[PDB]
Amino acid sequence: MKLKLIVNGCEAPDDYKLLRTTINTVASLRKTAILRFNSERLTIISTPKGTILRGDTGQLWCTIPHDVFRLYTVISARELNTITMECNCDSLLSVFKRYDRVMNSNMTIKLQSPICALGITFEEIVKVIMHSFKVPVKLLFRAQDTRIQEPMINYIQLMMYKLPPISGEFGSAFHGFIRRVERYSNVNHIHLMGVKVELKIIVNELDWHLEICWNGPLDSVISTHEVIIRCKDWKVCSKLYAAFEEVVLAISHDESCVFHCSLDRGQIIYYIARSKGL
Amino acid sequence: QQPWVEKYRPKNLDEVTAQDHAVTVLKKTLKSANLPHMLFYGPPGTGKTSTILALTKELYGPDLMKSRILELNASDERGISIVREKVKNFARLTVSKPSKHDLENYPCPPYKIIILDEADSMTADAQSALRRTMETYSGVTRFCLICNYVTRIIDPLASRCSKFRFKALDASNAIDRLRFISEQENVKCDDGVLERILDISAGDLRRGITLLQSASKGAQYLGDGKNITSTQVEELAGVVPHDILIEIVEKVKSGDFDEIKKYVNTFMKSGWSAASVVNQLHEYYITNDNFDTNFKNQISWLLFTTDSRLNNGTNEHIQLLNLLVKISQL
């Protein structure tokens, strides 16, 4: 087995930023993240695999291609040279932000120090300054990788919604509409709603029945469809929408909300489970 | 799927058994619109929450219910401030309009119901606050107070609220309901059982249903495919076997203090419940023809005192030993 990759911020700022976007999202969701270092792609998974006293059920499954990495030499004894690896997200955030600060030369990562470690090496010029980092990781086995499977979603009630891009006339407007739910301190369970189109965020309280809507023209990727979710999931959704041009919002009637984000490819899907039954 | 108590909770007023008085009054109120303020009281597991939920459903339907009902129970704060603000605000609220479907399918009387379950846990200050809130808004809001102990409800609120006493569910009262539940869950019971279940569960159908479910689970785990006997029911209901009780009686008869002390030590090592053995001793002694009237008077007062002391969360060992020693000197 051997793991090494070559990532340069300058050659492709977009995919490097997509990589940093992912690291932060998986850090914000919870600690640790599974790095399914397949020989031909990388999938970064942050799953509860559940919750007892917190409510953590959100699962993010980001797929990034191998072509994003300049060099993606990955070999092992598993099928199609699969290395799955769990590492604390704080250290990976620190490594990536340090490399970004230095860039603001290539970044070299090799699997070098059960409990293994990774090695991040890159050079800074002000003069020659070398920056070496070692994040403690764990060599997860194939058996533990088998039980990590993305949630299959039905298509009998999963209506899709093509949200307007972040850049353009509607970019700031839709961002404001998404974030308008964040200006109240009693909003924990938002209630999405879709009528066949309009996107209504409904807040239920004894004070006053708030009914935020979206009057702008909205399209569908292709009947009511209402899903109650927590507010942290919506914060993650807004952060995803901020850095994603193409975003798909899929709703399962009284079930779950699927936030599909693409970068034409590096794709991000956020699985959100209903908090309350309507 | 679910525990049989929550699975077989009545959904309409027809399913509620043995409480005919209150249920007919409420059913007649269905076709009228002058529902009073109701005070539901009775022993535990007698069908009060079931009755109020069934009535509220029959009144409003699943849709209007969420907008025309406010429920407060002991799991939420119900202080004087809460009673003065939240309950008064809900009573002040105008009656939400019904929809077309609600207007045609359900009766939808022109008022809202405030259900205060576990009202015996409210301080007298909160009830005093509730007095005029109940009164001055009687044309727009109806109040339901549910409790086990009426004496915890202050006299003004007991006067304002119409009183609906729920009878204890004996064998005769709830035998049909227990048979219904047993047959629908495919429970094979020997004759005599389903009456022992209701005799052990004195005035409590929740306890009887849970006992039946536990007996069914045992008989299913056995895989033997035989009926449930009364002995099994008494075993898993916490009833002391007749032989142990007979030994207790015989050691009391020979009034030696040390023998009784040693036997009580071993018996309390056996983990029995002092209330249950005290009850069984009551049955044995008061129904026995071998004792005279004077002995029965003294034993009745001793058992009453022991039961009252045990109801106060005292030490079961000390109370039982004192009771048995007192009986030995009678």
Binding site: T57 | Q1, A74, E118, Q213, K261, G271, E316
Partner: protein, 346 residues
Amino acid sequence: SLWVDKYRPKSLNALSHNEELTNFLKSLSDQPRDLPHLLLYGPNGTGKKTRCMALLESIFGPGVYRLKIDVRQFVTASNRKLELNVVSSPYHLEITPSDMGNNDRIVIQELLKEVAQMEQVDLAHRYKCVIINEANSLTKDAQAALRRTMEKYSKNIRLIMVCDSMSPIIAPIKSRCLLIRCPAPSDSEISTILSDVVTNERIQLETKDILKRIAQASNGNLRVSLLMLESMALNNELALKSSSPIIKPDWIIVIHKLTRKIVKERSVNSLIECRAVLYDLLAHCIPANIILKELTFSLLDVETLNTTNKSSIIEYSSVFDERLSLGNKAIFHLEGFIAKVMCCLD
């Protein structure tokens, strides 16, 4: 680790002292979906918590024993900070509301209504159990919230509360639970468990009678007997003889000395000395109910007292235990019991 924890049965098949209770637990755990609310009541130290954990392992599989402890903060009416420790594993929760005093109602409301409403969907929905140790210590206000909490939110949460002498548990709570009686082991089973422990621990044993002595001296208390076994194992260089003394806790010895003094010298100055001893006992957080119980059952073991004195002692003990239940200061009732005993003995 202690021998009580080192040899704790981690499975429903590893429990080897009651059998019939194990059969009932297996019957309950065959179909976990329709599991009711349970109430385990029996003498202290018999193994009720072990039975609960074995049932939880039977239902949710191994992993219920991976306990994570976290401190969660509360606020009372007077806005003071309270810190309850919640021993939380996956698939179940442990709460000891008695860690707070009369302020356990806010815990039983906030912490438990939080999880009762919060569902456990992750499309599949499971019910997460909650264990309430020492259900007797609830103050009739936590139980009133408890009853509706578990009646209405049964679909998402299940309650398994352990207790001994469930008389201070209110009728609505008892009616809402399946009553599981856990009797204490006989001396033979305690001796067998101790034999297995010493065999796995390589302690040299002279004779098997010194295990029956431990079992009899522990009064059907598995944990107490195992702690005695470890004590005489580490105080005799891992070689136990019939000369090895039966060791009892310090407060038990103090109570026996107090009994001897009360029987011997009966005056107001003796009453004051007894008050000093009782204050020393209360300074060690020994609950007054068990202080009175041990005092009574040590005074009833004195052979110099006739039947009249013993009957008077038990009557006064019952009266003052009821007084202690409804009281606020324990010293009044302890001193009253001792004074009545000293006045009746002479």
